[PDB]
Amino acid sequence: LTEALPKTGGRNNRGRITSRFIGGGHKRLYRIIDFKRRDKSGVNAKVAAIEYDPNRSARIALLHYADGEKRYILAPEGLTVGATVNAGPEAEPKLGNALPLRFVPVGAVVHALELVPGKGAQLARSAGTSVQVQGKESDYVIVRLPSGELRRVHSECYATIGAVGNAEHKNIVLGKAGRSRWLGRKPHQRGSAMNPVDHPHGGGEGRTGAGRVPVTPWGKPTKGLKTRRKRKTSDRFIVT
Amino acid sequence: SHYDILQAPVISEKAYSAMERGVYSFWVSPKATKTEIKDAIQQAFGVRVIGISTMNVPGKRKRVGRFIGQRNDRKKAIVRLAEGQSIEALAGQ
RNA sequence: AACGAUAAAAGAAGUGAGAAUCUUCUUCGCCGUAAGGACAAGGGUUCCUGGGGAAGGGUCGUCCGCCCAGGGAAAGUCGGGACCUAAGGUGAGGCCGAACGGCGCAGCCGAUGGACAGCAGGUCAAGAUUCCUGCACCGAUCAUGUGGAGUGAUGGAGGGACGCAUUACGCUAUCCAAUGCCAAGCUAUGGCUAUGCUGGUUGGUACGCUCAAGGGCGAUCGGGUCAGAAAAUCUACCGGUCACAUGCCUCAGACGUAUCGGGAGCUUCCUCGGAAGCGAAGUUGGAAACGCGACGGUGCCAAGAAAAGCUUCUAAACGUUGAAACAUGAUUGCCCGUACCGCAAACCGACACAGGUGUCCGAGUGUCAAUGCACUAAGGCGCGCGAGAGAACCCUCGUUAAGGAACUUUGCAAUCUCACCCCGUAACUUCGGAAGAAGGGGUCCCCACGCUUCGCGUGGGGCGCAGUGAAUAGGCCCAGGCGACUGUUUACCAAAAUCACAGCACUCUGCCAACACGAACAGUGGACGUAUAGGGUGUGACGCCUGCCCGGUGCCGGAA
RNA sequence: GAAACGAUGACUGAAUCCGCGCGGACCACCGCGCAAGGCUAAAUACUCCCAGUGACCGAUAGCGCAUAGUACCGUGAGGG
RNA sequence: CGAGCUGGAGAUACGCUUUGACUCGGGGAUGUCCGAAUGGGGAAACCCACCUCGUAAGAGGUAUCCGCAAGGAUGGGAACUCAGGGAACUGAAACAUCUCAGUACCUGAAGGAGAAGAAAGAGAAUUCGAUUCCGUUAGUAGCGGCGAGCGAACCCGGAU
Ligand SMILES: [Mg+2]
Ligand SMILES: [Mg+2]
Ligand SMILES: [Mg+2]
Ligand SMILES: [Mg+2]
Ligand SMILES: [Mg+2]
Ligand SMILES: [Mg+2]
């Protein structure tokens, strides 16, 4: 427990509620976690400890740089306490090392990957995830994202060797209700158990099931949502 | 100056039977921070003050007339000079 | 018809034009985790004194929370402000907008939280950590001495910084017992005669090689450039050195001495009942916090504010003759609140309304325990109509021959059961449970004996109809529908088979994500998250499962 | 609408005297006027305030008010 | 201005008035606190600062926007004026055009008045000749689910 900014609940913006549900809590805090990890490249550090922190589902490594400063950094599946972390293109592609893709061996399974030089990590970071490399092209690398997708990425971007783990939300069965309350307000409210007024799947004497749409009028099963833009060219194989 | 501010002497009996012990009390003005007042008095009766104490007071009366009343608000003040007891004679009153 | 809860009232005496209804006395009865006490908020003078007697007071009223007049409220340290910050509010300069205006970093406002110097008594008719009395503490400003030198920021670091459950040890507040101590007297009804009865039986401060559980702890040297924007004699990291034990540092509290106060009562005057003066003892044994020691121990996951004060550290800086710091004196101390009601005739309910209101204190005896239940201290109160009568009927209770669900839509209602020991306890079961299953027994008093003590066991004895002897105090079982479960809901006719739920499934979403609020290529929420994530929809523990029909609509893809 | 001209958000984009606009699509002829700079009395409107008047009222009328936006009701806007 | 005055108040006391009070006219001086409010905070009338002038008491400045600078602006006005934005009931015996309307309401700006104004005009006479207002033309021309219904201008008279 140490050196972290305070987090405050809030499930809606300026005026009213925006992202339904979510209201419970516990008071959790925020721990600034190094993602971009460049200003520190060129300095070795050791796993002082792996603390378990919320707002993440992902162990947290408390690294210490020769500089003297500490910096929490996601903990990949494997690092024990006391090992070594080193940033900068000059780094043995091992667990915890952060080295851009250009310098990353094909078939190498890494996470914490960015999408644009800096602004921190972005892909592969949530509890146990693995984005492996496919095979450099020109300036961009082909990689496989946890959703089974293929995106070019200019190898200019660092990455962390290895895959996160923090065990696995597989046996975590949240027991009975109220565990969800240890986190977010009573989940989903069956709009089919509301009123013609309140939502599309309202009324009906008895029990319904027609039209299939979201709280508003769109459709939820198999209706595309992404639009026509840039990244679009920079992408390969959305479906599946 | 000095002679200003004070508003009148607190008659009552306690006050009076409070005088017999060299504790003089009178009605100062509502706005009249405990110091100004401490000053004024000294220089109006020539004498210092070992201690002071003051607090505000509301009013709201009438006899009749659908004219209810209205506060009148005062600020009794109570002082204590140095062993050199008494003030003028407006004490032995 | 009503006079607003069925907690009762009686007599005497007094006042008065007039009193059931005011005052005094003596009794009775009701509350006592309160119907006592202290605040908050809210209300304001409702407080105290003297008058009053229209109207208000469900009745009288000579009285009142009502009317009139006067009085009352006192703080360097208690709360708040001149200090801090949270949500949120606002916001120069910025981003947006038909107008009005919408957002927004720093900054600022903003407690309900942080921080911070006093205690013990006395006492006006009415105030009190505010006034007095005793002793104390804090800051500030000056003088004197000591000192002999730096002082050290709107900046860095350290720290303030913080959960839930359970738990060891010492202690106090507080409470209990006694042929302890002090004081007052009397006792008679049959007895006691005091080893009876009643009452009191220490609070503050200062010193004491006194006792004392518990609790806290690295310092130092150096290294490195890459860390704290910078600087550092600070902080972090690296390593060296001693960090077993321990050791220190600190003492909740007790004890002794001193001293200050208080102390049952005593005495005196009396204008009728206050006023004034004085004063004893302070033991041994037992219990004991939700507090104190302390930011104690263990365990647990859903993983538990910020900011200033504070501690150290430099920048800059004036200064190293006269510094910072200590002490001893002195002077100094601002504004606002402090009366009274405050679980209630003083606040919200149109009424002095059977309701509603946050926090704290909350005695004793008995009963495993207890903030339960019964009685009762302190204290508070008998509820602002009263008296008779003793019919029908209505409400709230007690008992009821014989029968025992025959009642009836339904055993609705009302009984039975009813606590704590011991013995005993089915199907079925996710092996937890079903269980307090079901059923049976005990339970008081005396004495001896032994036990771990309050208490209890063993044996004998005793009394009643009866011994959790009075109050609190499960009726039980078989079988089926629905829903798995705890939970949630129609404030004022529906609590449920409703909703939610853990679990499952489809699908959308590549991250300025899908999606949603919005005048807006602003801002923001999703998320300071990133696909084992987030959105949407349906299903709803667990178990065995879940088929056939894509003509039609939709959704995806193809696409001449 | 056959519908001109004025106007403007969006794209465009001219001339200048043997020049430019219009005279209700459109053309010629005929005709009236010169746009893309500006300031300007006066007659016009209303009525908080003032005076005068009234085949206006004279107290359930007249203003809500012989005065009060008070009492009283509402958390408030507000009503009164 | 000349006997009275001492406010409504109907009261008592004290008093003031020809070196003409009082009252009426007309200029000055004072004018706490809040309020655009503007030193900073603020749940209005309260709470806290600072700099300067200084006997201290006490005085004054301390807001944002335009401008060297004077100096101007922020606020408030019953209705009237223009402008930006702009309903619905209702009619049409229903209703979507259309009507009700560009009215009601919101907002901005302004004054005592505004707005408009000195012609790339209207008109058919080769006429008038800034704007505005009243009369008339006329309910004519025309607009219109050519339905409901809406409704000009020139000329001419007059204010100026
Ligand atoms: Mg009776
Ligand atoms: Mg069945
Ligand atoms: Mg259920
Ligand atoms: Mg339930
Ligand atoms: Mg009459
Ligand atoms: Mg009036």
Short mmCIF file of all heavy atoms in Angstrom, two decimals, chain C residues 66-81:
data_model
loop_
_atom_site.label_atom_id
_atom_site.label_comp_id
_atom_site.label_asym_id
_atom_site.label_seq_id
_atom_site.Cartn_x
_atom_site.Cartn_y
_atom_site.Cartn_z
P C C 66 -46.26 32.06 26.37
OP1 C C 66 -45.31 31.52 25.36
OP2 C C 66 -45.73 32.95 27.43
"O5'" C C 66 -47.34 32.86 25.53
"C5'" C C 66 -48.42 32.17 24.87
"C4'" C C 66 -49.76 32.79 25.23
"O4'" C C 66 -50.28 32.21 26.44
"C3'" C C 66 -49.68 34.27 25.57
"O3'" C C 66 -49.63 35.12 24.46
"C2'" C C 66 -50.91 34.50 26.40
"O2'" C C 66 -52.02 34.77 25.57
"C1'" C C 66 -50.99 33.19 27.18
N1 C C 66 -50.38 33.26 28.53
C2 C C 66 -50.92 34.14 29.51
O2 C C 66 -51.86 34.91 29.20
N3 C C 66 -50.40 34.13 30.75
C4 C C 66 -49.38 33.36 31.04
N4 C C 66 -48.90 33.43 32.28
C5 C C 66 -48.80 32.48 30.08
C6 C C 66 -49.32 32.47 28.85
P C C 67 -48.63 36.36 24.52
OP1 C C 67 -48.45 36.83 23.13
OP2 C C 67 -47.44 35.99 25.33
"O5'" C C 67 -49.46 37.40 25.41
"C5'" C C 67 -50.62 38.03 24.89
"C4'" C C 67 -50.96 39.24 25.73
"O4'" C C 67 -51.55 38.82 26.97
"C3'" C C 67 -49.75 40.06 26.14
"O3'" C C 67 -49.36 41.01 25.18
"C2'" C C 67 -50.24 40.74 27.39
"O2'" C C 67 -51.06 41.82 27.02
"C1'" C C 67 -51.04 39.61 28.03
N1 C C 67 -50.19 38.78 28.91
C2 C C 67 -49.78 39.31 30.12
O2 C C 67 -50.15 40.44 30.42
N3 C C 67 -48.99 38.60 30.93
C4 C C 67 -48.59 37.40 30.58
N4 C C 67 -47.78 36.76 31.41
C5 C C 67 -48.99 36.80 29.35
C6 C C 67 -49.79 37.53 28.55
P C C 68 -47.88 41.59 25.24
OP1 C C 68 -47.72 42.50 24.07
OP2 C C 68 -46.89 40.48 25.48
"O5'" C C 68 -47.92 42.49 26.55
"C5'" C C 68 -48.71 43.67 26.60
"C4'" C C 68 -48.41 44.42 27.87
"O4'" C C 68 -48.83 43.65 29.02
"C3'" C C 68 -46.93 44.61 28.11
"O3'" C C 68 -46.48 45.67 27.31
"C2'" C C 68 -46.89 44.87 29.61
"O2'" C C 68 -47.32 46.17 29.97
"C1'" C C 68 -47.94 43.88 30.11
N1 C C 68 -47.35 42.59 30.52
C2 C C 68 -46.74 42.48 31.80
O2 C C 68 -46.74 43.47 32.56
N3 C C 68 -46.16 41.31 32.15
C4 C C 68 -46.16 40.29 31.31
N4 C C 68 -45.54 39.17 31.69
C5 C C 68 -46.78 40.37 30.02
C6 C C 68 -47.36 41.52 29.68
P A C 69 -44.92 45.82 26.99
OP1 A C 69 -44.80 47.03 26.12
OP2 A C 69 -44.42 44.53 26.48
"O5'" A C 69 -44.26 46.06 28.43
"C5'" A C 69 -44.39 47.31 29.10
"C4'" A C 69 -43.66 47.30 30.43
"O4'" A C 69 -44.27 46.34 31.32
"C3'" A C 69 -42.20 46.89 30.39
"O3'" A C 69 -41.37 47.98 30.07
"C2'" A C 69 -41.95 46.47 31.83
"O2'" A C 69 -41.64 47.56 32.64
"C1'" A C 69 -43.29 45.84 32.22
N9 A C 69 -43.27 44.38 32.10
C8 A C 69 -43.86 43.64 31.11
N7 A C 69 -43.62 42.36 31.19
C5 A C 69 -42.83 42.24 32.32
C6 A C 69 -42.25 41.11 32.92
N6 A C 69 -42.33 39.90 32.40
N1 A C 69 -41.57 41.29 34.08
C2 A C 69 -41.45 42.55 34.54
N3 A C 69 -41.93 43.69 34.03
C4 A C 69 -42.62 43.46 32.91
P G C 70 -39.88 47.70 29.55
OP1 G C 70 -39.30 49.01 29.17
OP2 G C 70 -39.93 46.63 28.52
"O5'" G C 70 -39.12 47.13 30.82
"C5'" G C 70 -38.60 48.02 31.79
"C4'" G C 70 -38.00 47.27 32.93
"O4'" G C 70 -38.99 46.36 33.48
"C3'" G C 70 -36.85 46.36 32.57
"O3'" G C 70 -35.64 47.08 32.55
"C2'" G C 70 -36.86 45.39 33.73
"O2'" G C 70 -36.35 46.02 34.88
"C1'" G C 70 -38.37 45.17 33.92
N9 G C 70 -38.86 44.06 33.11
C8 G C 70 -39.63 44.14 31.98
N7 G C 70 -39.85 42.98 31.42
C5 G C 70 -39.19 42.08 32.24
C6 G C 70 -39.06 40.67 32.15
O6 G C 70 -39.49 39.91 31.27
N1 G C 70 -38.35 40.16 33.22
C2 G C 70 -37.84 40.89 34.25
N2 G C 70 -37.25 40.21 35.24
N3 G C 70 -37.93 42.21 34.33
C4 G C 70 -38.61 42.73 33.30
P G C 71 -34.41 46.52 31.68
OP1 G C 71 -33.30 47.51 31.75
OP2 G C 71 -34.95 46.13 30.34
"O5'" G C 71 -33.94 45.23 32.48
"C5'" G C 71 -33.46 45.34 33.81
"C4'" G C 71 -33.25 43.97 34.42
"O4'" G C 71 -34.51 43.25 34.40
"C3'" G C 71 -32.27 43.06 33.69
"O3'" G C 71 -30.97 43.25 34.21
"C2'" G C 71 -32.74 41.68 34.10
"O2'" G C 71 -32.21 41.32 35.35
"C1'" G C 71 -34.26 41.87 34.19
N9 G C 71 -35.00 41.45 33.00
C8 G C 71 -35.75 42.26 32.19
N7 G C 71 -36.30 41.62 31.20
C5 G C 71 -35.87 40.31 31.36
C6 G C 71 -36.14 39.17 30.58
O6 G C 71 -36.80 39.10 29.54
N1 G C 71 -35.55 38.03 31.11
C2 G C 71 -34.78 38.00 32.24
N2 G C 71 -34.33 36.79 32.62
N3 G C 71 -34.49 39.08 32.96
C4 G C 71 -35.07 40.19 32.47
P G C 72 -29.71 42.77 33.37
OP1 G C 72 -28.49 42.96 34.21
OP2 G C 72 -29.81 43.44 32.06
"O5'" G C 72 -29.96 41.21 33.16
"C5'" G C 72 -29.54 40.27 34.14
"C4'" G C 72 -29.72 38.86 33.62
"O4'" G C 72 -31.11 38.73 33.21
"C3'" G C 72 -28.94 38.47 32.38
"O3'" G C 72 -27.65 37.96 32.71
"C2'" G C 72 -29.78 37.34 31.82
"O2'" G C 72 -29.55 36.15 32.55
"C1'" G C 72 -31.19 37.83 32.12
N9 G C 72 -31.88 38.50 31.01
C8 G C 72 -31.91 39.84 30.73
N7 G C 72 -32.62 40.13 29.68
C5 G C 72 -33.08 38.91 29.23
C6 G C 72 -33.89 38.59 28.11
O6 G C 72 -34.34 39.34 27.25
N1 G C 72 -34.14 37.22 28.03
C2 G C 72 -33.65 36.28 28.90
N2 G C 72 -34.00 35.01 28.66
N3 G C 72 -32.87 36.57 29.94
C4 G C 72 -32.63 37.89 30.04
P A C 73 -26.34 38.63 32.05
OP1 A C 73 -25.36 38.92 33.14
OP2 A C 73 -26.73 39.71 31.12
"O5'" A C 73 -25.70 37.51 31.12
"C5'" A C 73 -25.79 36.12 31.42
"C4'" A C 73 -26.12 35.39 30.15
"O4'" A C 73 -27.32 35.98 29.65
"C3'" A C 73 -25.08 35.52 29.04
"O3'" A C 73 -24.41 34.25 29.09
"C2'" A C 73 -25.88 35.76 27.75
"O2'" A C 73 -25.87 34.66 26.88
"C1'" A C 73 -27.32 35.90 28.27
N9 A C 73 -28.38 36.75 27.74
C8 A C 73 -28.90 37.89 28.29
N7 A C 73 -30.00 38.30 27.70
C5 A C 73 -30.19 37.39 26.68
C6 A C 73 -31.19 37.27 25.72
N6 A C 73 -32.23 38.08 25.65
N1 A C 73 -31.09 36.26 24.83
C2 A C 73 -30.04 35.44 24.92
N3 A C 73 -29.03 35.45 25.79
C4 A C 73 -29.17 36.46 26.66
P A C 74 -22.96 34.01 28.40
OP1 A C 74 -23.18 33.69 26.98
OP2 A C 74 -22.22 33.06 29.25
"O5'" A C 74 -22.21 35.41 28.51
"C5'" A C 74 -21.62 36.05 27.37
"C4'" A C 74 -20.43 36.85 27.80
"O4'" A C 74 -20.83 37.65 28.94
"C3'" A C 74 -19.31 35.96 28.28
"O3'" A C 74 -18.37 35.67 27.23
"C2'" A C 74 -18.75 36.60 29.53
"O2'" A C 74 -17.51 37.24 29.36
"C1'" A C 74 -19.89 37.52 29.98
N9 A C 74 -20.60 37.08 31.17
C8 A C 74 -21.46 36.02 31.32
N7 A C 74 -21.93 35.90 32.53
C5 A C 74 -21.35 36.95 33.23
C6 A C 74 -21.43 37.36 34.57
N6 A C 74 -22.17 36.75 35.51
N1 A C 74 -20.71 38.44 34.94
C2 A C 74 -19.96 39.05 34.01
N3 A C 74 -19.80 38.76 32.73
C4 A C 74 -20.53 37.69 32.40
P A C 75 -17.67 36.85 26.36
OP1 A C 75 -17.41 38.07 27.15
OP2 A C 75 -18.43 36.97 25.08
"O5'" A C 75 -16.28 36.19 25.96
"C5'" A C 75 -15.09 36.45 26.69
"C4'" A C 75 -14.33 35.16 26.92
"O4'" A C 75 -15.31 34.20 27.34
"C3'" A C 75 -13.68 34.50 25.72
"O3'" A C 75 -12.39 35.02 25.38
"C2'" A C 75 -13.66 33.02 26.10
"O2'" A C 75 -12.55 32.57 26.83
"C1'" A C 75 -14.87 32.91 27.01
N9 A C 75 -15.96 32.16 26.43
C8 A C 75 -17.04 32.58 25.72
N7 A C 75 -17.85 31.61 25.36
C5 A C 75 -17.26 30.47 25.88
C6 A C 75 -17.61 29.12 25.84
N6 A C 75 -18.71 28.65 25.25
N1 A C 75 -16.78 28.24 26.44
C2 A C 75 -15.68 28.70 27.04
N3 A C 75 -15.24 29.94 27.15
C4 A C 75 -16.09 30.79 26.53
P G C 76 -11.31 35.42 26.53
OP1 G C 76 -11.29 34.46 27.64
OP2 G C 76 -11.50 36.85 26.84
"O5'" G C 76 -9.93 35.31 25.76
"C5'" G C 76 -9.86 35.55 24.36
"C4'" G C 76 -8.82 34.67 23.72
"O4'" G C 76 -7.51 35.07 24.20
"C3'" G C 76 -8.92 33.19 24.04
"O3'" G C 76 -9.80 32.53 23.13
"C2'" G C 76 -7.48 32.71 23.89
"O2'" G C 76 -7.13 32.46 22.55
"C1'" G C 76 -6.71 33.92 24.41
N9 G C 76 -6.35 33.87 25.83
C8 G C 76 -6.70 34.75 26.82
N7 G C 76 -6.19 34.45 27.98
C5 G C 76 -5.46 33.30 27.74
C6 G C 76 -4.68 32.53 28.60
O6 G C 76 -4.44 32.72 29.81
N1 G C 76 -4.12 31.43 27.94
C2 G C 76 -4.30 31.13 26.62
N2 G C 76 -3.71 30.02 26.14
N3 G C 76 -5.03 31.86 25.80
C4 G C 76 -5.57 32.92 26.42
P U C 77 -11.03 31.66 23.69
OP1 U C 77 -12.13 31.67 22.69
OP2 U C 77 -11.29 32.13 25.05
"O5'" U C 77 -10.46 30.19 23.81
"C5'" U C 77 -9.74 29.60 22.75
"C4'" U C 77 -8.92 28.45 23.26
"O4'" U C 77 -7.95 28.93 24.20
"C3'" U C 77 -9.72 27.36 23.96
"O3'" U C 77 -10.07 26.56 22.82
"C2'" U C 77 -8.74 26.82 25.01
"O2'" U C 77 -8.01 25.69 24.57
"C1'" U C 77 -7.76 28.00 25.23
N1 U C 77 -7.68 28.76 26.49
C2 U C 77 -6.77 28.37 27.49
O2 U C 77 -6.08 27.37 27.43
N3 U C 77 -6.70 29.21 28.58
C4 U C 77 -7.41 30.38 28.75
O4 U C 77 -7.11 31.14 29.65
C5 U C 77 -8.34 30.68 27.70
C6 U C 77 -8.45 29.88 26.65
P C C 78 -10.60 25.05 22.95
OP1 C C 78 -9.47 24.13 23.25
OP2 C C 78 -11.37 24.85 21.71
"O5'" C C 78 -11.67 25.02 24.13
"C5'" C C 78 -12.21 23.76 24.57
"C4'" C C 78 -13.68 23.63 24.19
"O4'" C C 78 -14.45 24.62 24.90
"C3'" C C 78 -14.08 23.77 22.72
"O3'" C C 78 -14.04 22.49 22.09
"C2'" C C 78 -15.53 24.19 22.83
"O2'" C C 78 -16.42 23.09 22.97
"C1'" C C 78 -15.54 25.03 24.11
N1 C C 78 -15.42 26.47 23.89
C2 C C 78 -16.39 27.11 23.13
O2 C C 78 -17.33 26.45 22.67
N3 C C 78 -16.29 28.44 22.91
C4 C C 78 -15.26 29.12 23.42
N4 C C 78 -15.20 30.42 23.18
C5 C C 78 -14.26 28.49 24.20
C6 C C 78 -14.37 27.18 24.40
P G C 79 -13.56 22.34 20.55
OP1 G C 79 -13.00 20.97 20.44
OP2 G C 79 -12.77 23.50 20.10
"O5'" G C 79 -14.89 22.30 19.67
"C5'" G C 79 -15.92 23.22 19.90
"C4'" G C 79 -16.74 23.40 18.65
"O4'" G C 79 -17.84 24.26 19.03
"C3'" G C 79 -16.04 24.13 17.50
"O3'" G C 79 -15.42 23.28 16.54
"C2'" G C 79 -17.18 24.93 16.89
"O2'" G C 79 -18.01 24.15 16.07
"C1'" G C 79 -17.92 25.36 18.15
N9 G C 79 -17.25 26.49 18.77
C8 G C 79 -16.14 26.47 19.59
N7 G C 79 -15.75 27.66 19.95
C5 G C 79 -16.66 28.51 19.35
C6 G C 79 -16.76 29.91 19.38
O6 G C 79 -16.03 30.70 19.97
N1 G C 79 -17.83 30.37 18.63
C2 G C 79 -18.71 29.57 17.95
N2 G C 79 -19.71 30.18 17.30
N3 G C 79 -18.63 28.26 17.91
C4 G C 79 -17.59 27.80 18.63
P G C 80 -14.35 23.91 15.50
OP1 G C 80 -14.10 22.87 14.46
OP2 G C 80 -13.19 24.50 16.26
"O5'" G C 80 -15.13 25.09 14.77
"C5'" G C 80 -16.14 24.81 13.82
"C4'" G C 80 -16.74 26.10 13.30
"O4'" G C 80 -17.35 26.85 14.39
"C3'" G C 80 -15.77 27.10 12.72
"O3'" G C 80 -15.36 26.74 11.42
"C2'" G C 80 -16.58 28.39 12.77
"O2'" G C 80 -17.54 28.53 11.75
"C1'" G C 80 -17.26 28.25 14.13
N9 G C 80 -16.41 28.85 15.15
C8 G C 80 -15.62 28.21 16.07
N7 G C 80 -14.91 29.03 16.78
C5 G C 80 -15.26 30.29 16.32
C6 G C 80 -14.80 31.56 16.70
O6 G C 80 -13.95 31.85 17.54
N1 G C 80 -15.41 32.56 15.97
C2 G C 80 -16.35 32.36 15.00
N2 G C 80 -16.81 33.46 14.41
N3 G C 80 -16.80 31.18 14.64
C4 G C 80 -16.21 30.19 15.34
P G C 81 -13.85 27.04 10.97
OP1 G C 81 -13.68 26.34 9.67
OP2 G C 81 -12.94 26.75 12.10
"O5'" G C 81 -13.81 28.62 10.76
"C5'" G C 81 -14.74 29.28 9.91
"C4'" G C 81 -14.54 30.78 9.99
"O4'" G C 81 -14.93 31.28 11.29
"C3'" G C 81 -13.11 31.29 9.84
"O3'" G C 81 -12.73 31.34 8.48
"C2'" G C 81 -13.23 32.69 10.42
"O2'" G C 81 -13.83 33.58 9.51
"C1'" G C 81 -14.19 32.46 11.59
N9 G C 81 -13.51 32.30 12.87
C8 G C 81 -13.34 31.13 13.57
N7 G C 81 -12.69 31.30 14.68
C5 G C 81 -12.40 32.65 14.72
C6 G C 81 -11.70 33.39 15.67
O6 G C 81 -11.20 33.00 16.72
N1 G C 81 -11.62 34.73 15.32
C2 G C 81 -12.14 35.27 14.17
N2 G C 81 -11.95 36.59 13.99
N3 G C 81 -12.81 34.57 13.27
C4 G C 81 -12.90 33.28 13.60
#
